[PDB]
Design a protein around this motif. Structure first.
Motif, PDB file in Angstrom:
ATOM      1  N   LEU A  72       0.961   2.087  -3.222  1.00 29.71           N
ATOM      2  CA  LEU A  72      -0.286   2.521  -3.798  1.00 29.71           C
ATOM      3  C   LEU A  72      -0.374   4.038  -3.812  1.00 29.71           C
ATOM      4  O   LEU A  72      -0.800   4.635  -4.805  1.00 29.71           O
ATOM      5  CB  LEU A  72      -1.428   1.914  -2.998  1.00 29.71           C
ATOM      6  CG  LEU A  72      -2.816   2.141  -3.558  1.00 29.71           C
ATOM      7  CD1 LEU A  72      -2.938   1.511  -4.939  1.00 29.71           C
ATOM      8  CD2 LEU A  72      -3.831   1.559  -2.605  1.00 29.71           C
ATOM      9  N   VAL A  96     -10.500  -0.329   2.359  1.00 26.03           N
ATOM     10  CA  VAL A  96      -9.179   0.242   2.452  1.00 26.03           C
ATOM     11  C   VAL A  96      -8.134  -0.859   2.414  1.00 26.03           C
ATOM     12  O   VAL A  96      -7.310  -0.884   1.527  1.00 26.03           O
ATOM     13  CB  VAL A  96      -9.014   1.175   3.696  1.00 26.03           C
ATOM     14  CG1 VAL A  96      -8.423   0.482   4.914  1.00 26.03           C
ATOM     15  CG2 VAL A  96      -8.181   2.392   3.330  1.00 26.03           C
ATOM     16  N   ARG A  97      -8.182  -1.808   3.319  1.00 32.91           N
ATOM     17  CA  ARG A  97      -7.136  -2.818   3.325  1.00 32.91           C
ATOM     18  C   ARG A  97      -7.443  -3.922   2.326  1.00 32.91           C
ATOM     19  O   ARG A  97      -6.553  -4.404   1.628  1.00 32.91           O
ATOM     20  CB  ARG A  97      -6.922  -3.394   4.724  1.00 32.91           C
ATOM     21  CG  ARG A  97      -7.873  -4.520   5.076  1.00 32.91           C
ATOM     22  CD  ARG A  97      -7.743  -4.931   6.521  1.00 32.91           C
ATOM     23  NE  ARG A  97      -8.579  -6.095   6.827  1.00 32.91           N
ATOM     24  CZ  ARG A  97      -9.119  -6.347   8.019  1.00 32.91           C
ATOM     25  NH1 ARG A  97      -8.912  -5.521   9.032  1.00 32.91           N
ATOM     26  NH2 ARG A  97      -9.855  -7.435   8.200  1.00 32.91           N
ATOM     27  N   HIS A 114      -1.302   7.075   4.666  1.00 29.92           N
ATOM     28  CA  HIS A 114      -1.902   6.501   5.864  1.00 29.92           C
ATOM     29  C   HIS A 114      -1.150   6.821   7.142  1.00 29.92           C
ATOM     30  O   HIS A 114      -0.059   7.382   7.124  1.00 29.92           O
ATOM     31  CB  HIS A 114      -2.000   4.989   5.712  1.00 29.92           C
ATOM     32  CG  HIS A 114      -0.701   4.335   5.322  1.00 29.92           C
ATOM     33  ND1 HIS A 114      -0.457   3.835   4.059  1.00 29.92           N
ATOM     34  CD2 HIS A 114       0.428   4.101   6.035  1.00 29.92           C
ATOM     35  CE1 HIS A 114       0.764   3.328   4.015  1.00 29.92           C
ATOM     36  NE2 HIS A 114       1.322   3.478   5.200  1.00 29.92           N
ATOM     37  N   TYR A 136      -7.312  -2.355  -1.306  1.00 35.09           N
ATOM     38  CA  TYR A 136      -6.030  -1.774  -1.677  1.00 35.09           C
ATOM     39  C   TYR A 136      -5.062  -2.899  -1.955  1.00 35.09           C
ATOM     40  O   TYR A 136      -4.158  -2.778  -2.768  1.00 35.09           O
ATOM     41  CB  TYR A 136      -5.467  -0.862  -0.597  1.00 35.09           C
ATOM     42  CG  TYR A 136      -6.108   0.513  -0.534  1.00 35.09           C
ATOM     43  CD1 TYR A 136      -7.237   0.820  -1.287  1.00 35.09           C
ATOM     44  CD2 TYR A 136      -5.586   1.503   0.291  1.00 35.09           C
ATOM     45  CE1 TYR A 136      -7.819   2.071  -1.226  1.00 35.09           C
ATOM     46  CE2 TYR A 136      -6.164   2.757   0.357  1.00 35.09           C
ATOM     47  CZ  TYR A 136      -7.282   3.035  -0.401  1.00 35.09           C
ATOM     48  OH  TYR A 136      -7.862   4.284  -0.339  1.00 35.09           O
ATOM     49  N   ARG A 137      -5.299  -4.012  -1.281  1.00 32.63           N
ATOM     50  CA  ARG A 137      -4.456  -5.183  -1.409  1.00 32.63           C
ATOM     51  C   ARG A 137      -4.692  -5.948  -2.724  1.00 32.63           C
ATOM     52  O   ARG A 137      -3.928  -6.860  -3.040  1.00 32.63           O
ATOM     53  CB  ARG A 137      -4.693  -6.095  -0.207  1.00 32.63           C
ATOM     54  CG  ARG A 137      -5.901  -6.993  -0.350  1.00 32.63           C
ATOM     55  CD  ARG A 137      -6.356  -7.559   0.994  1.00 32.63           C
ATOM     56  NE  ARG A 137      -5.335  -8.402   1.614  1.00 32.63           N
ATOM     57  CZ  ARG A 137      -5.552  -9.163   2.687  1.00 32.63           C
ATOM     58  NH1 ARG A 137      -6.758  -9.215   3.240  1.00 32.63           N
ATOM     59  NH2 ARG A 137      -4.566  -9.888   3.197  1.00 32.63           N
ATOM     60  N   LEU A 156       0.819  -1.196   0.000  1.00 33.17           N
ATOM     61  CA  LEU A 156       0.000   0.000   0.000  1.00 33.17           C
ATOM     62  C   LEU A 156       0.857   1.251   0.000  1.00 33.17           C
ATOM     63  O   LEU A 156       0.433   2.331  -0.427  1.00 33.17           O
ATOM     64  CB  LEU A 156      -1.022   0.038   1.130  1.00 33.17           C
ATOM     65  CG  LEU A 156      -0.623  -0.371   2.563  1.00 33.17           C
ATOM     66  CD1 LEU A 156      -0.871  -1.850   2.806  1.00 33.17           C
ATOM     67  CD2 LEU A 156       0.812  -0.028   2.897  1.00 33.17           C
ATOM     68  N   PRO A 195      -7.564  -1.483  -6.092  1.00 30.83           N
ATOM     69  CA  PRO A 195      -6.721  -0.283  -6.218  1.00 30.83           C
ATOM     70  C   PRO A 195      -5.255  -0.557  -6.610  1.00 30.83           C
ATOM     71  O   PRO A 195      -4.705   0.147  -7.459  1.00 30.83           O
ATOM     72  CB  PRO A 195      -6.809   0.298  -4.816  1.00 30.83           C
ATOM     73  CG  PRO A 195      -8.216   0.041  -4.424  1.00 30.83           C
ATOM     74  CD  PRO A 195      -8.576  -1.282  -5.035  1.00 30.83           C
ATOM     75  N   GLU A 196      -4.619  -1.560  -6.002  1.00 26.99           N
ATOM     76  CA  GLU A 196      -3.231  -1.875  -6.339  1.00 26.99           C
ATOM     77  C   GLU A 196      -3.210  -3.031  -7.326  1.00 26.99           C
ATOM     78  O   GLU A 196      -2.341  -3.128  -8.187  1.00 26.99           O
ATOM     79  CB  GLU A 196      -2.416  -2.192  -5.080  1.00 26.99           C
ATOM     80  CG  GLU A 196      -0.998  -2.663  -5.347  1.00 26.99           C
ATOM     81  CD  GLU A 196      -0.138  -1.654  -6.089  1.00 26.99           C
ATOM     82  OE1 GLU A 196      -0.454  -1.333  -7.252  1.00 26.99           O
ATOM     83  OE2 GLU A 196       0.885  -1.216  -5.526  1.00 26.99           O
TER      84      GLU A 196
END
Length: 70
Positions: A25, A51-52, A29, A55-56, A22, A59-60
């Motif tokens: 990313l 979010v986690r 944070h 993002y894991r 992240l 998003p990423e």
């Protein structure tokens, strides 16, 4: 304010994979070492999951970089 303990980067492991993940990313944070893990806080409550958990992998795991390599 924009700091909900939901994410953590195992300070006890080769977190470079996740903390890196992240941090890769956009690293927007809060890092705070809670109980025994370095911990990352950037959601809300409903955002927490997004979010986690996204993002894991989304998003990423976007056309950007990561995907199924989390």
């Amino acid at each position: 304010m924009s700091a909900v303990q939901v994410l953590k980067f195992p300070l006890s492991v080769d977190l470079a994979g996740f903390v890196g993940l992240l941090r890769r990313l956009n690293v927007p944070h809060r890092v705070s070492e809670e109980s025994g893990q370095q911990v990352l806080w950037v959601p809300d409550e409903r955002l927490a999951e997004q979010v986690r958990e996204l993002y894991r992998r989304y998003p990423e795991g976007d056309p950007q970089a990561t995907l199924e390599a989390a």
